[model samples]
Target: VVGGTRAAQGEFPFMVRLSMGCGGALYAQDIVLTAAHCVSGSGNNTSITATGGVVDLQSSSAVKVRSTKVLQAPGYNGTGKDWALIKLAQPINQPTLKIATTTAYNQGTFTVAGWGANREGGSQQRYLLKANVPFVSDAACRSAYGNELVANEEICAGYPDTGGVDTCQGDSGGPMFRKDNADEWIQVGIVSWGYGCARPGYPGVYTEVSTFASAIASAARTL
Candidate 1:
């Protein structure tokens, strides 16, 4: 997390740190929602471990769950459909995050949480970090990345004029969320990729969660 603050313990219980060096969110008691690029493909991946229930990665209080299977987005091609689901060997006791099925709350400010680097080529963090970024409109996002911006498949967030807050390397698969009308936290985006960490004219691009909500749910059922 670049230009972010240290998150308090339990502040984001759904936040997950994958042993594969990425972040994710608890989609269910046994399902983890992350980016497809973080995994190899849609199949069994027993080697991955997920840590949650705490901010500090090395804390003994953290809950760890080994992955039993992975279900990458069916049409993931590196550019679009960047989401995936990881089935845990067992259920995690932490509170799971609800995903947004629509783009109603895509605007306004959103909070991004992860254990990624604070800046480009910087060190990764032990404690979870968070930062607020206003929604980057589709028009503006396209202006910045040209055709490379998969507007429908991705959501952009950050200060375009200022090269400061963003999710750097190691933050992939993390959650980009905000409070809904009922004041409940809802995951709307999944940290995917960008040109650089918080660089001007290049906002952090994420997997637009709403676009793949149904697909994720269907995959979770089979996983």
Candidate 2:
């Protein structure tokens, strides 16, 4: 992620690293939330592995496991809440994050978690990284991406000029979350994509949580 700091172990308890793909969020027992593109062509992630419970990949505390089932949301090709669920062989003991089941799509500061690169075209980092960014309006996003922005299905966050903090390579499918009124972490966005890392006029686009809450629930509830 651009302009991010190193994350301590278990700092983002819900975060997960999908091998050679995007990051993931722990949804429930054996269920991982990630971007649809990450699981493309892998109906069953029997060979896909996941590293959880630790921010540092080199850390031995990380619980590494292979997945059992990989299910993509309906009509998922790319973008617009490109979400998927990867079921693990067994449940993890680390803290899992809750998807925002309620319709609370308001603007606010949200933190993104991942083990992505620190800069554009940079090498992926072994340690996890995080950055805080403020939510942007749909109109603002439309101005940047033109007809590319999908209403309801997507939301955006970043600086209007030369974004200082943002997601980059290896960060996609991670979480854009904030604390809820219940004092629980509620994920509002998935690290979907951006034109470039922290580029001015190219804010990061994410899968709006409210639009696909049911899709997320269905995937996790079944299989």
Candidate 3:
């Protein structure tokens, strides 16, 4: 899903690049899903905003979609459920992205694209970055970060032996996509947090999209 070809060598017009001064993704045409912590540092919904969508990396004549509504998962209190949905002012004409129905367990492969910090604890965010990573089972992730770190609401991805690709700061809310049999990419996770960018023994964590499918679908119906 890295569109680098000359004909497609530009940031996606429909993509909502977050404006939280950090990088994130717009998972749906009417909803820009992002990490809860990105909105509220303590994972509280009181600080979440229902207006002002992401500023396009490159300006275009295309109309900017304003965020009209905000919905944060009920149980999101910083421990788990690091996901939120923002409704748009208008429904995008582009086809909506697909979400994975199947769970990605051990060694499952997927792709993640974003504009995050190049290094761990870095402040500078790259224009854009992408990587194909393999998902690790909950046990493996817990083994590395301890049981309290990984949760059912989270999905992990990365290679323990070799680590050249992963996510970092500002990458929160990016999509982690997996290809289906139809040759289409389905988003299965939303970049949430991680120990560091591509760190060994520690995999990048994301919000489990499958777990939020009902809410997403319900929100889509309203849009």
Candidate 4:
């Protein structure tokens, strides 16, 4: 995250730190929610693992599970349709995050967590970090990324004015969420891409969760 702080252990039990250095959210005991681009470059031949249930990946409390397969949506082309599901070698009994069945929070603050780079071009974090970013409109995002903004598939969030908070390098495929009326953290977005680390007038963008139920469901069936 851009303007982020260290997260406490178990603070985000669903957070997954992949071996490829990106982050993801646990969608099932063995299924994880992530961005298609996170593994697209590797031609789907990467030995990914899921280090979850704790704040720090290097810490002893965290549990690491090997991945069995990585599934990308049918339309994945490094741009549109940017979400994927990863299956672990075996299921671990841990808390999983719920996908946004409805695209509700079009505004307000949402929390993003990851073990990504603390600063642009910097090294990744050993301990997990988190930050709260306010939602931005599609118009504002278009001002930054232009037609590259696929409004229907993505959501933007940032403090474009102060430029201190966002998901930066190595934070790809992480979870962006908010608590619902039932006080459960429902994931709204999957960290996709950003122009840079907290650049003014530009915010981090994510794959909207509710829009890809068919692709997500199809991939999850393998597990």
* Top of the candidates by TM-score: 1
**Model 4 residue 3 CA deviation in Å:** 1.6
After TM-score superposition, what is the CA distance of residue 122 in candidate 3 from its true location, in Å?
3.0
- Cα RMSD to the true fold for all candidates: 0.8, 1.3, 4.6, 1.8
- Per-prediction TM-score to the true structure, in the order listed: 0.98, 0.96, 0.79, 0.94
Q: Which residue pairs in model 1 clash with each other? A: none
Off by over 4 Å in 3: 1-14, 22-27, 41-56, 59-63, 104-107, 219-223
Candidate 4 C-alpha lDDT tens digits along 34-56: 88888753234338878887776
Model 1, range 1-223, lDDT digits (tens) per residue?
A: 9999999998989999998889999999889999999998988889999998889989998889899999999977888899999999999898999999999988999999999999899888999999998899888888888989886899999998885999999999999999999999999999999998898999999999999999999989998
lDDT of 4: 0.84
Estimate the TM-score for candidate 3.
Answer: 0.79
How many steric clashes does model 1 contain?
A: 0
| lDDT, each prediction | 0.92, 0.85, 0.62, 0.84
Model 4 Cα shift for residue 26 (angstroms)? 0.9
Tens digits of lDDT, candidate 2, 85-201: 899998878888888866574478888978888888898888888899889898988999987888888889989777878999899989899889987789998989889889888
> Considering lDDT, where higher is better, how would the candidates rank from best to worst?
1, 2, 4, 3
Report how far off residue 191 is in candidate 4 (Å).
0.5
Identify the candidate with maximal lDDT: 1
Give the distance in Å from residue 213's predicted Cα in candidate 4 to where it truly belongs: 2.4
